Structure formats: structure tokens, C-alpha cells
Amino acid sequence: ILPVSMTKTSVDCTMYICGDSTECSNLLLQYGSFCTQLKRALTGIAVE
Amino acid sequence: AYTNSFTRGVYYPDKVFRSSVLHSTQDLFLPFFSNVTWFHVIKRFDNPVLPFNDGVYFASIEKSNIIRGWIFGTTLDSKTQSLLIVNNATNVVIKVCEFQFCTFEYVSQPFLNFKNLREFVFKNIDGYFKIYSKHTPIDLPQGFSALEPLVDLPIGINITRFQTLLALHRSGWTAGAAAYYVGYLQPRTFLLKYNENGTITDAVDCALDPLSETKCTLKSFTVEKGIYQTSNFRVQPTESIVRFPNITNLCPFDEVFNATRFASVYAWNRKRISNCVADYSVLYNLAPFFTFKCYGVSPTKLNDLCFTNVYADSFVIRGDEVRQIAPGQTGNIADYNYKLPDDFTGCVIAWNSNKLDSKVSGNYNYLYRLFRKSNLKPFERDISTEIYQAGNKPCNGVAGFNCYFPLRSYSFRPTYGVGHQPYRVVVLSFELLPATVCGPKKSTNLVKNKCVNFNFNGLKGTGVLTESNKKFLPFQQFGRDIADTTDAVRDPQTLEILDITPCSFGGVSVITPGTNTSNQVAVLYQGVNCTEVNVFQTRAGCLIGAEYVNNSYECDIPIGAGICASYQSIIAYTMSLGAENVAYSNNSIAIPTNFTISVTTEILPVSMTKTSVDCTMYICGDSTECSNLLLQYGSFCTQLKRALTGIAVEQDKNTQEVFAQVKQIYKTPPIKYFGGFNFSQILPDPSKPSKRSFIEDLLFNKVTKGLTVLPPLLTDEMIAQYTSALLAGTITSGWTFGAGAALQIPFAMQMAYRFNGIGVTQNVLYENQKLIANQFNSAIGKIQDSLSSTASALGKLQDVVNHNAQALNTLVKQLSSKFGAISSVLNDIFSRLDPPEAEVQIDRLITGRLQSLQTYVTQQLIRAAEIRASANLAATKMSECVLGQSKRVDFCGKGYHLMSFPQSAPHGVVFLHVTYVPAQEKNFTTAPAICHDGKAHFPREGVFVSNGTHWFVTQRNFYEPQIITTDNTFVSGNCDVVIGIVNN
Numbered sequence A: 001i002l003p004v005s006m007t008k009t010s011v012d013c014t015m016y017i018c019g020d021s022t023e024c025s026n027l028l029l030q031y032g033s034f035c036t037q038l039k040r041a042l043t044g045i046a047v048e
Numbered sequence B: 001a002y003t004n005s006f007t008r009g010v011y012y013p014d015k016v017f018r019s020s021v022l023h024s025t026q027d028l029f030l031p032f033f034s035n036v037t038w039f040h041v042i043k044r045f046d047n048p049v050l051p052f053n054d055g056v057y058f059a060s061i062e063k064s065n066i067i068r069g070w071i072f073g074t075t076l077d078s079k080t081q082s083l084l085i086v087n088n089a090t091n092v093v094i095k096v097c098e099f100q101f102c103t104f105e106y107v108s109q110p111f112l113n114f115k116n117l118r119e120f121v122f123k124n125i126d127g128y129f130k131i132y133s134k135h136t137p138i139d140l141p142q143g144f145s146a147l148e149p150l151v152d153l154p155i156g157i158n159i160t161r162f163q164t165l166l167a168l169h170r171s172g173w174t175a176g177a178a179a180y181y182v183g184y185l186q187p188r189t190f191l192l193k194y195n196e197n198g199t200i201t202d203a204v205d206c207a208l209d210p211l212s213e214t215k216c217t218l219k220s221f222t223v224e225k226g227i228y229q230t231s232n233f234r235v236q237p238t239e240s241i242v243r244f245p246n247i248t249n250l251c252p253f254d255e256v257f258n259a260t261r262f263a264s265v266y267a268w269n270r271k272r273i274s275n276c277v278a279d280y281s282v283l284y285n286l287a288p289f290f291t292f293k294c295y296g297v298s299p300t301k302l303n304d305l306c307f308t309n310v311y312a313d314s315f316v317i318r319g320d321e322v323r324q325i326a327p328g329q330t331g332n333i334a335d336y337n338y339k340l341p342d343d344f345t346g347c348v349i350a351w352n353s354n355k356l357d358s359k360v361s362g363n364y365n366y367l368y369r370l371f372r373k374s375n376l377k378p379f380e381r382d383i384s385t386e387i388y389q390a391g392n393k394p395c396n397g398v399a400g401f402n403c404y405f406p407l408r409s410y411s412f413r414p415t416y417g418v419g420h421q422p423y424r425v426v427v428l429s430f431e432l433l434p435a436t437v438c439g440p441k442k443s444t445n446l447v448k449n450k451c452v453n454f455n456f457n458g459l460k461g462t463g464v465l466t467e468s469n470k471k472f473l474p475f476q477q478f479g480r481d482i483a484d485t486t487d488a489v490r491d492p493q494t495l496e497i498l499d500i501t502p503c504s505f506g507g508v509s510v511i512t513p514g515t516n517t518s519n520q521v522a523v524l525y526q527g528v529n530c531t532e533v534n535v536f537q538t539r540a541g542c543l544i545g546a547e548y549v550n551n552s553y554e555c556d557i558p559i560g561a562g563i564c565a566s567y568q569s570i571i572a573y574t575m576s577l578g579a580e581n582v583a584y585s586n587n588s589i590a591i592p593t594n595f596t597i598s599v600t601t602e603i604l605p606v607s608m609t610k611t612s613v614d615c616t617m618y619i620c621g622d623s624t625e626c627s628n629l630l631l632q633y634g635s636f637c638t639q640l641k642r643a644l645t646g647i648a649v650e651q652d653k654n655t656q657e658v659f660a661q662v663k664q665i666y667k668t669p670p671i672k673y674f675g676g677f678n679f680s681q682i683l684p685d686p687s688k689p690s691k692r693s694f695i696e697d698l699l700f701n702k703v704t705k706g707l708t709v710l711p712p713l714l715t716d717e718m719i720a721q722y723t724s725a726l727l728a729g730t731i732t733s734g735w736t737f738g739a740g741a742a743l744q745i746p747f748a749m750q751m752a753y754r755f756n757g758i759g760v761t762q763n764v765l766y767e768n769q770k771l772i773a774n775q776f777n778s779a780i781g782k783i784q785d786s787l788s789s790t791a792s793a794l795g796k797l798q799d800v801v802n803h804n805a806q807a808l809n810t811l812v813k814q815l816s817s818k819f820g821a822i823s824s825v826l827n828d829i830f831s832r833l834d835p836p837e838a839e840v841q842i843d844r845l846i847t848g849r850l851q852s853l854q855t856y857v858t859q860q861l862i863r864a865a866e867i868r869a870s871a872n873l874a875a876t877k878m879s880e881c882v883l884g885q886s887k888r889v890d891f892c893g894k895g896y897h898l899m900s901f902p903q904s905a906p907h908g909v910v911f912l913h914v915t916y917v918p919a920q921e922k923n924f925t926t927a928p929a930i931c932h933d934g935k936a937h938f939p940r941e942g943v944f945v946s947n948g949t950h951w952f953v954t955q956r957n958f959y960e961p962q963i964i965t966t967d968n969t970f971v972s973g974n975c976d977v978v979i980g981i982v983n984n
């Protein structure tokens, strides 16, 4: 056996951190490009 | 009546310059392609007053200056401030005085098919009035115009109303024919582009269109054809649902209030009320209480607040003595019978009961404490009927002088007045120390087939609440799944379970072809039902804007679950694999007669933008305080630097393995006599000044602080020279220069050796030398054209250069991540903050940046390993493809390998592999064996095929018949094993 694929998992940083909480998500948006680079890395995982 | 506002309102945000860079900003902006009302001027007069709101983009088709000035105000008196602008005979006058149709004045420069335009901006953004002016000689027409900033005036006033003013003509009045338009600014993000001079050329609002969002994400006005992640679909909970037991039972409030006879005030009855639901809304609606006072609790939060326990204190007192039941208030009842704490958080309820608690002969059953020894401490209760010693003589249990019974009876008679009527009083003590005491909370009816927010016995979440036909054990309240997430819950009063499935949120992507091709877009939603969001439902989600096709074509833009969309509107479909072809055969053979020598670009990243980070300089700069603070945090910085040095030495050694595979440097003579195989685009021309290949030139012009970039040990020139040496070896001397000296060997016989490698005799080459040469050179020309005209030819190198680039870019922007402080320079923190807290915040900020750098170098090592493996593959395939022939399939490109030619590239390599690709098979005849004289004759290497007339021995891959001699056939057994063999 050679494993071929994982389950590609594009995790939204905002959903992961605050869910649908508008106040928490808005506060998260202040924090910077953390979620941006994380999502880009995860999408890189998926496209790979 | 309505018309398109088109593309007006774009302006420079402030007085900063940007050179050929794209910035996205978030302020109040005018929407694009907006449907704006059209005005008319001609006996109907339209004189409306436009509301300022948050601001307006006000442009005028103005000639000869009919429009003069505006009036801003709300009340038109001295309480408010009004701004007035006029343009008298010389100049433009800016004033602020309280005219009844002085505080501020200003002076500007003198001003001294549609043709003239005057654009103005009314912005009041945090008290700022940024001024812009743009006039250009020319339904707002199709065109482009930006508004340069002139003055940013911090007026600091609120604007809501504005209106333009006209003037008649004196020379009798004449009104011109024109139309003006007013939009509105909203918070939205644009895509600014600046030219090589530094002016705005093209602008796109992000959320204007799906294509606009694609442009906003990709930071370009040109976008390749493909699928791009945009956002995530947020399913909004339709309704809020709450479900509690709170069954009728509720709390036994009635038994306390509606009791027959209460206990007296001195021995007031304390009832613990708990494990029930409050219904205080009845008490307010009761309207039968003479006194209703709540001190520490207000009715708004009273009915929806939880407390540990609530106690029901009830008794009967007189009307005049009701008022002593109050925190702070004292007296004969509030000191000896029952004292409220001065912090009484609760309610006081009292009502008249002269009907029940008054007997005609005198109701003497309700008593008080008249005269008590001292005052009472909190939570003290004097029920002692001890005879008072009001003097010196001890009371030996008998009454008399200085010996009185501490309890006296109320004179409750119906004839008595209002104050002497028995007023039944109930006090509910509110205190909090577990929450078994709650109010109604409103059990809201549930919904079905909708993911909403719910409150099931104190549990909250989002997911669809649908019918479920599972039977779970009665005592268990709710369940969970393998991943511990809740999947069902029991609602009280029905005892039925509802299966909870995760709500239907998913990502948002836009299927959009290249802007050079079209501009129609469609939106894909990840795992979203089409009934909650023309509209088509995929196996992967809901597709909006495209039309599904029963016919299936070849996939080009993956959508999801095999759905793929191609251009016609943009049509989507389940992807078609291809053409069902293979015709399995028993007695049928086919012998190829022709082929193509395709040449395919193969791309491998080799190097990265290697860097070393001074940790102290990175985090602090030249700040001595910050350096002194940081150096005490340990050798994390040393780990960082040394890991980066490992990266750099790894990069150099990969480069050496790739290029300096041979220490001896062979050279290409200016006399490039290859017998008609011109390699000018790959081999640097001695006439070319910088000794670089034209393909390298195409590559290089196609491809595009506080940190360093170390030069490669082998510069671009030296790498090119290494590649030239490799080419010279593998061409003039062939593959052996890897194993030692470049043993010279003529090129035609080297290719003959290669065909012997793939199973072809050198005679086949010699008969095909010229034609394969022409095919190869034409293929080289196709390579030239493809690399020159193909933006996707450099996908891998261009993206790895990217990955490095935006890695460093997120690195530098991380320094711009403020983390909630005032200034990243330590001086402002120290000057406006206490030094002790300034130090701690400094530590927090620097440790955040340190974590960021560690994370960056973490992924830098990740690509270090990845591209290191890739470059190992690159060296291996120069060994197997340049330094020899590879037996490996799909390793020197697609198919049997023939030859390879390395080429230099920025931080990587590019190859032109010669991969053998057959074509045009021809279908033939064969027999298992040929039996001659009862003897089976087999070719040593070939296969007997017959075209229909004669038997021939030929090649396994091609039809080259020859005479079956005694040197190709061998003596081995007989023919008696094969079935159906023929005698030939």
C-alpha cells in the first residue's frame, strides 16, 4: 500500500476561530494576515 | 428616469504617491454600474434637497458657472453652524457665518456631446473634509477621470443635508439644458492601478461583480482562465429557537400569595423556592397589590435572569407599617421583627386583606415584636417570648412592672382606618451564590430543514433541525457522534429527538474565463443546497450563473466532484474522460510505421531566495533598549540564523550537484559543426555579448527591508557556463563526461547508440538521420514559439519564485502587524505609557514577531526539503537524461527517452527533453510460429509478420523486413506445442 491522498481540508480561519460570531470575527480581522497565509497554505495543500 | 452611473467617483485617497503598484483601500466609495436617476431642466421645476448622509460624489456639467455654492445645516439658527461658499467678481470666497436665509473664513485661487465637467467631493470622514478638483474638456459619458486631492480640512462637524443653489441670468431669465447626478459612498474596496508616471489608469471595486472579486484577489486587471477561491458562503440562521421544560408546574408562587392565613411579622415564614421556573409577569399584571416596590431588581432584566436560590418571606402587617419594608428604612418593624439589608436586591409586595384578616370582634392573631433588647444583626431572628426586664428587678417568669411580654397583638378590626387594615406582605429574597431558579425564557417553536441557532436545555449551536426516526433510551438527554459533535437533542414536552446535521456553509469560488476572452461569470458554492441560496445543483454544491449541459466535454476548469465548466455564457458539465477506444485482439497485430519526436518543456525549481536573518536587527532595529530586552530571551535567534545558514549551504550544494557535477570544464568551440543540428537558441552564441541563450533571455524577461539576499556561488553567467559545459559534453562527447573525461564521439553515432538503447538499429537512423534532424529542428522552433508566447510555460518556476516573493512579503508585512499598540517605535510607548507596562507590551510585541519569524523559517525549511528533493530529482534526471539514457518511464518526460538538453533558469532549470512518441499505427497479421521442415524457426530478436502475401522478419516496433537467414534463427525443439501453427 502507498497512500495517495489525504482529505483536502480548506479550513476557514475565521470560522475556525470565531464561528459565525460577528464581533469575534471582526476582532479577528484586525489581527493581520495570519488567516490569509494559513488559508493560502491549506489551499496549496489541496491543490497539491 | 433611471440611468447607469457608470465609472465615476474614483479618486486618490490622500497625498501619498504610488509607483506602478496596486493598493486596496477600505473607505466610503461610490458603487459601479449603479442605476442613478436622471434629472431634467426646462412649467415644472424640480428643486430637491439631496441628503448628505455619509457623503456624496457631486459632479456637474457646468459651463459659465450657474452653480455657485451650497448650504449645509440642519436647524438654520445660531445653535448650529452653517457653511457658505460664494464666487464674487474676483475670487472664490469660503466662509462660515450664521446667515438667516462669523466663525470661519477661507480663500482659494481665482477661478478666472457635452463639453465641460466639474467634479466635487463632499466627504465628512471623522471630521475631515478632503477636497478634490478635476476639470476636463469633453447620461454621464464613458470615460476615465481621477480626482487629485487638494485640501484636507479637519472641520469636525456633522453634515446631513445639502443642496445646490442657482442664479438667473441678467443681461428676463434663461435656463440651460443639463442634467446632474448624485450617488452615494459605501464601505467597499477598490483595485487601484498606477501607471509608469504614477497616475490612475484602471479601477475595479472588489465586490462589484464576481469577476471584480477575482480581480481584487489576484491583484490584476488581467486574469488567467481558471477557478479561484473567493470567500465562504455564510448561511444565516433564519430564526432563534429556545426550548425548555419550564412545564406549567413553574414555581409555587400562588401558595405563598394566595395562602389562607399568613404567619405574623415577628415569626415571618421563610419558604425556599427552587428547582422551578419563575412567572413574574403575572405579578405585574396582577394589579391587586397595594405596594409593589422592587429596589435591587428592575423589571427589564428581572424576568430573564438566573439566581442560585429565591426565598419567599410572607407575613401580615398594617397599612402604615408597610412602608418600613425598605432597605435603609428602619423603625419598630424593620428593627425588631424583620430587617431588610441596606443592599436589598429584591422586591417588596403588599396588598390589602381587610376582608380576610379582620374579625368583627377583633382579629388578635397577628402579632409583632414591639420592644426588643437590642437591634438585630443580619440573618438574626428573635422568636424569643422572653419576658422583658425593663429595670433592675429580675422577671421570675411573671408579668408586672418592668416585666412585659415582648409580643403585642394588632388591633385588626374592620371598622379601623386604611392604615390599620391588615396588609398582607410577601417578600421574595433575591440572592446568588448551579442555576435551578430561572424565568419563562420563552420556549420558541422549532423549525425544520433550516440551520439556525437553538437553545435546547442550555445548549446552543448551528445546524439543520429535521425529523429523525431513531429511538434512543429515555433517560439519555442528548447524543454525540464519533467526532464528539452533537447530532441530536430531545425537546421537552414532546420527548422527541431531532437529527442535527452540520449547517450548509461552504466556500465561494468564481468560474471565470480570461478577461481577454470574455467577462461573464458564474459562482460555485461548496456543498450548499440550491434550495437555501441559471441555478444548478452539482454533486459538490450549488452552481449559479452557468447552464448545465447533458453533453460532457473535456475538463479545463475543475469545479468539484468532476463538474467542469468550459466556454460556449459559460457552460458547465460532468467532465468527460475522453474517447473509448481499446480493441483487444487475439490474432491481430499492428506495427507502427511513423511517429512524432515531440519536445516538451519540463520545469523544476532548484534554488530559492536564500536569506539570513539577524534576529536582533529584525525584531528591534537599532533600538538599544529593544536589543537589551531581546538578548535575554535565549538562543531562539541563534537557532533561526543557523537553520537559515543550513538552508543556504543546502542551496549551494544542490546548485553544485546540479551544475558542477563535473569539475573539469569542457567548452563549445565557435565552430559549431554538428552536421545540420542548429542549437542557437540553447547554446549561448560567442557573438552574443553576455554569453546567455536566447531561451534564457525569454525566461529572464518573462520572470520578475532588514533582510539579505546572498548571491549564488555560481552566478547567472557561471551557471550558464556550467550548462554550456554540460551541453558540450553530452553533445560532442556524449554521456561519459559524468563518469570521467569527455570521451569524444560523433553525434550521429551517439544518436545511433541512443536508438540502440530504445531498440533501433543505427541503419534506421542513417536512413532517417536527415528527417529526424528536420523534425528535431522544427520542434525546437515550436519550443521557441511556445516559450515566447506561452504565459503558462513557466508555471513551476514562476510560482516558486512567487512563493518566495510573497513569503518575504508576508514576512515584511508582519512587521506592520500592530497588535493593538500605539506605535511600533518604543519611544512613543515609553513617553505616553508607564515604563513597567511599556516593558511588558514590548515583550508581547517582540515575542509575537519572534513567533512570526520562527513560523516563516518553519515553512522555509518545508520548501527547503521539498525543493531539495526536487533538485535531487533534477540531478538524477540529468544523470539519466543528459548524462545518459533513462529506462525510467515518465522521468525524462512522457514516453521512451531519446535525449535531453539542460538550460539555465532563475533559481531553477528548464529542459528540452527528446521523448519518443509513436503515432499512426498500422494494423497487421502474425502467426505464433513458423514451422519449416517440421521445425519451428524463431528470430533471435524480431517478429514474423505477413502483409498478406509473404512472411517477413522485422522489428518489434516497425516494419523492416529482411531475409530469414541462419543467423537469426536457432535450433530449438519442434512445432508440436503450438495449436493451429502452420507449415511455412
Ligand SMILES: *[C@@H]1O[C@H](CO)[C@@H](O[C@@H]2O[C@H](CO)[C@@H](O)[C@H](O)[C@H]2NC(C)=O)[C@H](O)[C@H]1NC(C)=O
Pocket (backbone or CB within 6 Å): B593, B594, B595, B771
Ligand atoms: C510520416 O508521415 C509524414 C507525413 O507528413 C512523412 O513526411 C512526408 O514525407 C514525404 C516523402 O518525402 C514528403 O514528400 C513530405 O513533404 C513529408 N511531409 C512532411 C509534413 O514532412 C514522413 O516521411 C513519414 N515518416 C515515416 C517514418 O513514415
Ligand SMILES: *[C@@H]1O[C@H](CO)[C@@H](O[C@@H]2O[C@H](CO)[C@@H](O)[C@H](O)[C@H]2NC(C)=O)[C@H](O)[C@H]1NC(C)=O
Pocket (backbone or CB within 6 Å): B583, B588, B590, B921, B923
Ligand atoms: C484492426 O483490425 C480489426 C479487424 O477486425 C479492426 O476491428 C474493426 O475495425 C473497424 C474499423 O473502423 C471497426 O468499425 C470495427 O468496429 C472493429 N471491430 C470491432 C469488434 O470493434 C480494428 O479496428 C483494427 N485496428 C486498427 C487500429 O485499424
Ligand SMILES: *[C@@H]1O[C@H](CO)[C@@H](O)[C@H](O)[C@H]1NC(C)=O
Pocket (backbone or CB within 6 Å): B253, B254, B257, B258, B282, B283, B286
Ligand atoms: C392566585 O391563584 C391564581 C389562580 O387562579 C393565580 O393565577 C395567581 O397568580 C395567584 N396569585 C398570585 C399573586 O400569584
Ligand SMILES: *[C@@H]1O[C@H](CO)[C@@H](O)[C@H](O)[C@H]1NC(C)=O
Pocket (backbone or CB within 6 Å): B676, B677, B678, B679, B680
Ligand atoms: C539554425 O538556426 C539559426 C538561428 O535560428 C539560423 O540562423 C540557421 O540558419 C539555422 N540553420 C542552420 C543550419 O544553422
Ligand SMILES: *[C@@H]1O[C@H](CO)[C@@H](O)[C@H](O)[C@H]1NC(C)=O
Pocket (backbone or CB within 6 Å): B947, B948, B949, B950
Ligand atoms: C507484401 O510485401 C512484399 C515485400 O515488398 C511485397 O512484394 C508484396 O507485394 C506485399 N503484398 C501486398 C499485398 O502488398
